[PDB]
């Protein structure tokens, strides 16, 4: 069905009413979302079907129809924008300066904004509007609030 580039909500009618379980990015004919949003299941777009192509539980990412296309990276300096698409609410850009998630394999950007679990898959942007990662995979800090990583895949 509709394959126009842009941000999309990921919905399900299996629970009560229509529940938003996440968000995704359509670019170059490929839908990109977080693995915990779909669990690798095939999606629907009107009458058309979207089949998974690549996926990884550790990276927590999954592409549909084709290989992962998003390849931009946070420069470790500039402010970024979370295009947060919350359940039942209109898409909205929030500007923030990410922090650092320091790990045994390297440093990673981290956006400290708290939103419902259904906001998972919302893209994080650079000043050019390029997708530098997806929101929805992180940790719960001493304050109770959520701190998400800036999860980006690899473009083969």
């Amino acid at each position: 069905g509709e394959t126009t580039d842009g941000v999309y909500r990921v919905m399900t009618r299996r629970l009560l009413g229509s529940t938003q379980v996440g968000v995704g990015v359509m670019q170059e004919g490929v839908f990109h979302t977080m693995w915990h949003v779909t669990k690798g299941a095939a999606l629907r777009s009107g009458e058309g079907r979207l089949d998974p192509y690549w996926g990884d539980v550790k990276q927590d990412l999954v592409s549909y129809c084709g290989p992962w296309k998003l390849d931009a990276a946070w420069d470790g300096l500039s402010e970024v924008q979370l295009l947060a698409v919350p359940p039942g609410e209109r898409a909205k850009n929030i500007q923030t300066l990410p922090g650092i998630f320091k790990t045994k394999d390297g440093d990673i950007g981290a956006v400290a904004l708290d939103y419902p679990a259904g906001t998972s898959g919302s893209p994080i942007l650079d000043k050019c509007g390029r997708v530098i990662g997806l929101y929805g995979n992180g940790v719960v800090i001493k304050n109770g609030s959520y701190v998400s990583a800036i999860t980006q895949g690899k473009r083969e």
Partner: protein
């Protein structure tokens, strides 16, 4: 059975709401893709 609805363009918004802090956290990523705090 999951489905997708469009929610808008992916664009930078000048004069957007500027909020949130920039913390420096020590974390570990396990085999299941779940982050955890290290102290």
């Amino acid at each position: 059975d999951m489905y997708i609805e469009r929610a808008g363009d992916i664009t930078w918004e000048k004069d957007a709401e500027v909020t949130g802090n920039s913390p420096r956290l020590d974390v570990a990523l396990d085999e299941s893709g779940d982050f955890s705090l290290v102290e």
